[PDB]
């Protein structure tokens, strides 16, 4: 359950990671299949704007 976090702060739901690449600054980017969109809308996003979420367990 992945999400992209915008500069605005908002969270956008990710269907899946399509691909991965290293950028010119040596940092990882992921090709994002956005939930509700098709492959023509896939975009490369920086790793540090991606989040993984899980059901809350009081642990």
């Amino acid at each position: 359950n992945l999400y992209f976090q915008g500069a605005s702060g908002d969270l956008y739901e990710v269907e899946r990671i399509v691909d991965k690449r290293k950028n010119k600054k040596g940092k990882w980017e992921y090709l994002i299949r956005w939930k509700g969109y098709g492959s023509t809308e896939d975009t490369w996003e920086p790793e540090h704007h991606l989040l993984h979420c899980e059901e809350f367990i009081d642990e």
């Binding site: 992209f4 915008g6 500069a7 605005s8 908002d10 956008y12 975009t43």
Partner: peptide
Amino acid sequence: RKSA
């Protein structure tokens, strides 16, 4: 990008 996405934002908004």
